[PDB]
Design a protein around this nucleic acid. Sequence first.
RNA 1: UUUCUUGCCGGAGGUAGAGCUACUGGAUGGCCGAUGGGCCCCACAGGGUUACUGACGUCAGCCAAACUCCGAAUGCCGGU
RNA 2: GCCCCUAAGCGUGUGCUAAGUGGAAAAGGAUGUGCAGUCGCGAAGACAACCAGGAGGUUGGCUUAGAAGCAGCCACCCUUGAAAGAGUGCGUAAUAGCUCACUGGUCAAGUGAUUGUGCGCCGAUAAUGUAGCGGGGCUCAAGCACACCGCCGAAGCCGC
RNA 3: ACCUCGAUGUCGGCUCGUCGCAUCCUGGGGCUGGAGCAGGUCCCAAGGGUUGGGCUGUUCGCCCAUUAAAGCGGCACGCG
Lengths: 192, 136, 176, 23, 126, 37
Amino acid sequence: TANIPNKLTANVRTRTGKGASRQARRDGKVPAVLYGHGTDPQHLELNARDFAAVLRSHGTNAILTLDIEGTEQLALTKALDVHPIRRNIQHADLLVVQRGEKVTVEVTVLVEGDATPGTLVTQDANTIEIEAEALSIPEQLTVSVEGVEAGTQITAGQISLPEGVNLISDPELLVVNVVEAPSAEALEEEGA
Amino acid sequence: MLIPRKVKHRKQHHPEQRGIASGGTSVSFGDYGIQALEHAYITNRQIESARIAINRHIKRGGKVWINIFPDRPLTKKPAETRMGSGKGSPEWWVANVKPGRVLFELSYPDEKTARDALTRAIHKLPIKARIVTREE
Amino acid sequence: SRIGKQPVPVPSGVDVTINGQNLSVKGPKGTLTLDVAEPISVSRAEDGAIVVTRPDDERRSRSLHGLSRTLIANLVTGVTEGYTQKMEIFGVGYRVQLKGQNLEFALGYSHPVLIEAPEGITFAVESPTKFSVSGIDKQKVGQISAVIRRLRRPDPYKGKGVRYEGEQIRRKVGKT
Amino acid sequence: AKRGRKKRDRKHSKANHGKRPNA
Amino acid sequence: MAKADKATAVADIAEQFKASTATVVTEYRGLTVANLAELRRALGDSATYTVAKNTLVKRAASEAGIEGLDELFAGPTAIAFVKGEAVDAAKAIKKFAKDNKALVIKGGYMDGKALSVADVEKIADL
Amino acid sequence: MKVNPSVKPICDKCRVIRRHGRVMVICSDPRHKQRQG
RNA sequence: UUUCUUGCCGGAGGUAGAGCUACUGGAUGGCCGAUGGGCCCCACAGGGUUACUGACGUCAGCCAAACUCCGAAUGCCGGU
RNA sequence: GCCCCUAAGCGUGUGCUAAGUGGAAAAGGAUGUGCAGUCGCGAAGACAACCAGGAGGUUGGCUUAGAAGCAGCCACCCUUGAAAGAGUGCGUAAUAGCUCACUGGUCAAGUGAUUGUGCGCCGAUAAUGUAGCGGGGCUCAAGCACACCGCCGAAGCCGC
RNA sequence: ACCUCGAUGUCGGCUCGUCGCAUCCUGGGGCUGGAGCAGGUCCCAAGGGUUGGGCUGUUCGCCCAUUAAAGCGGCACGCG
Ligand SMILES: [Mg+2]
Ligand SMILES: [Mg+2]
Ligand SMILES: [Mg+2]
Ligand SMILES: [Mg+2]
Ligand SMILES: [Mg+2]
Ligand SMILES: [Mg+2]
Ligand SMILES: [Mg+2]
Ligand SMILES: [Mg+2]
Ligand SMILES: [Mg+2]
Ligand SMILES: [Mg+2]
Ligand SMILES: [Mg+2]
Ligand SMILES: [Mg+2]
Ligand SMILES: [Mg+2]
Ligand SMILES: [Mg+2]
Ligand SMILES: [Mg+2]
Ligand SMILES: [Mg+2]
Ligand SMILES: [Mg+2]
Ligand SMILES: [Mg+2]
Ligand SMILES: [Mg+2]
Ligand SMILES: [Mg+2]
Ligand SMILES: [Mg+2]
Ligand SMILES: [Mg+2]
Ligand SMILES: [Mg+2]
Ligand SMILES: [Mg+2]
Ligand SMILES: [Mg+2]
Ligand SMILES: [Mg+2]
Ligand SMILES: [Mg+2]
Ligand SMILES: [Mg+2]
Ligand SMILES: [Mg+2]
Ligand SMILES: [Mg+2]
Ligand SMILES: [Mg+2]
Ligand SMILES: [Mg+2]
Ligand SMILES: [Mg+2]
Ligand SMILES: [Mg+2]
Ligand SMILES: [Mg+2]
Ligand SMILES: [Mg+2]
Ligand SMILES: [Mg+2]
Ligand SMILES: [Mg+2]
Ligand SMILES: [Mg+2]
Ligand SMILES: [Zn+2]
């Protein structure tokens, strides 16, 4: 499992404040902050279209290499802020990472397969925490369900993982649950 | 018909209806859900009507979640009465909702049927609404 | 646009004269005049074809190009060969007959109904149950055909009335 | 009725800037 | 169908033609499923009966010298490969065509040259 | 000829058109005919 | 000039907001659930070998003028 | 505020409006129109249109008088393939037929969807006389949006 | 409770009008679970007409004989 960095251009902010941030967002640049173990916080700007394209292409957790006035830095998108209604990228958090580091990254999980007629699939947990080096973080994790019946509680620890990844979350977590199909009587009874 | 078992205080002011919802603005119980846009006081009977409308069309499979509960009361005084002489009595219960709040959540295999049921539900509410999914 | 792109062929036995925007065609069956839309210009290809061109690519020009092309094609075809339309009758005791330039019907009313023949159109009947209408102008032929058809109200039970050759009318049965 | 709606919508003129006495 | 699928079909017919001795071209229009299945069963003993696309066979014909059959691909075309012997399948298709009256043989290929319908009939008779 | 604020293609054969600023739907079945107003 | 305005400095609050394993209440869906703090033989010993209850726990998503682990701009007193 | 009533611009440049919107309004409905961003397909022949094939166990099981693809429930299996879906319907008590879904042969490049936005349409309806631009009138804007140049305008300020 | 208490006189009935259409008849159409007479529903339309009696002061309402019909409302619940 290997991944390649994505290149983007960033500029040093001239002014800081709510007015400046609003003006930049209106213009079409999303403000962001770069901080890490280097003890040297920096706050920059990115191109909204390019950033959105990169996120769409390579998921939420992507390795980014930045061109800061001719200097190259390796950064990871730690967290994002999204407006609940307009659905924009209000702000971004970037963490400096060098090759050969252990990081805690949350990765989404997907469920695919076929179910028996009396089986209904439910997903209690959508994300898990895994520890791996920067360049081998998976973009998606899949779990297969085929011909299960009755109680088939899928445990988080039971998920198959690649090499070089540690399951930070305890094995006690439950991710996917399978229960008998509902009925009209139960549906009517519930909610009254 | 959802009502609270008991409340510490039985008569209260009008709930505040300003601002944008902060919590519960993301949908994670199933696959599809509803989010509001306007401000209004959703009633218990409206909630019941929406739930019945969804269920009667979904029929066998799936299940529905409700993320709100009409616990805050409202009062009405007897008609044909002058003003004053004290406050009225509680009549119907409402739930405060703000833009971004997620109301209902449904999980079902078929996207077409799910969206049809959600639209049937939306048509019964007093405010505009939009269908949203689990993925970002 | 797509329909109007193809130039309209001109048969040898057709005489075409162009005077600015007015257009006239002389042929064996007669002559007719025409007026073209101002925004669109028409040109005569030297190889015996009609060329219609549009200056722009907006809504009005796009709409008018095909209309003008089809109208010119219809005009040339009509002046060349002509146009005809024939009908047929159904029911019991329904008859048609010809008297000079006029035509008389018998639809079962207390009185007989007459139809007046306008200019440039002639009626022809071969059988008491079937007749035909002939003319040169397609629009006029269609108008008179519609007027003839509208004489009797629709009947979805017994199908009594008049209609075109292969026209199929929806029918339903009243059990009572 | 018609009369009441007319006045309150007449406050949206350019000069009054949106505020008019007695609504 | 995808580009990979079309390429796979081209390669499939290319190798089928390479492994086959000769082939004939016929029209499958106006034939019912029952008689089509009957013909397939009759011809399955020695040869194979399938349907080929005009452009697809045109492209697959570039490898060999059968490019002269390009002019014969106008309209519907059903391709048959004679893996075993030559005359059995030709006579079978001729008898089926004359019995049905709804099938017309466009031509065939053998000896590295295309031949007209009269020559196809003569070789089938031989 | 139904007259309602909302007009929809009831069956898979209806076609929606526009005439003189009024949106009406026509179809082979007479029942399926209505207009806005 | 002790009045008022501006800059600077020292001052105590409990709103808006937000939060809940931080207290009192309302409350959405899951998990084992001993022990219903309890019921097929009542054995003094297998389970809802049976659709319950499931406490306490734990997974997550919420609400309150008479809830506050938190908490501002204006406002007010004093000094220059 | 600057077409006339009336003092001053039937001002300059770039775009939108076909509804007198401008000069009344909601849930909701819709092939009106301009801009920005998408995925699928398209020279290996896209979409529509105009000829052929659209089948065999098969009437799949329960249900019913009845159930054959089309009151209802379970799989929603499979052979032949180019394609057959336990089939979206308007068809008969039940069969039988018109068909259709994907696809073949002829023409030749646009064809669909949601995504966000500027303007618009329907929803529209009370009583003495148009009467919801102040009047005449205006889409050859005298309407709307973004920039630029001027003027008229009080007992406000300046001048004696 | 905003004008009228140094005054805005009142419920029905009689006489006399005028206006709106959310139409009772007369006039023109669409769809029908429209065979025809006769019916149900929607669309356009305000030129004309819309009776006489028994009962209560009535409004309202029941009833007796007719016609095409015996419409709903506004004008200080029209009009001393
Ligand atoms: Mg909260
Ligand atoms: Mg609503
Ligand atoms: Mg007010
Ligand atoms: Mg002092
Ligand atoms: Mg403090
Ligand atoms: Mg306190
Ligand atoms: Mg608050
Ligand atoms: Mg608590
Ligand atoms: Mg939460
Ligand atoms: Mg308060
Ligand atoms: Mg508080
Ligand atoms: Mg205070
Ligand atoms: Mg002047
Ligand atoms: Mg001008
Ligand atoms: Mg411009
Ligand atoms: Mg209008
Ligand atoms: Mg207006
Ligand atoms: Mg409106
Ligand atoms: Mg809508
Ligand atoms: Mg077919
Ligand atoms: Mg089968
Ligand atoms: Mg059934
Ligand atoms: Mg848009
Ligand atoms: Mg004016
Ligand atoms: Mg002064
Ligand atoms: Mg008073
Ligand atoms: Mg008084
Ligand atoms: Mg008095
Ligand atoms: Mg009086
Ligand atoms: Mg009317
Ligand atoms: Mg009438
Ligand atoms: Mg009716
Ligand atoms: Mg009338
Ligand atoms: Mg008159
Ligand atoms: Mg009146
Ligand atoms: Mg008086
Ligand atoms: Mg009076
Ligand atoms: Mg009066
Ligand atoms: Mg009155
Ligand atoms: Zn239809």
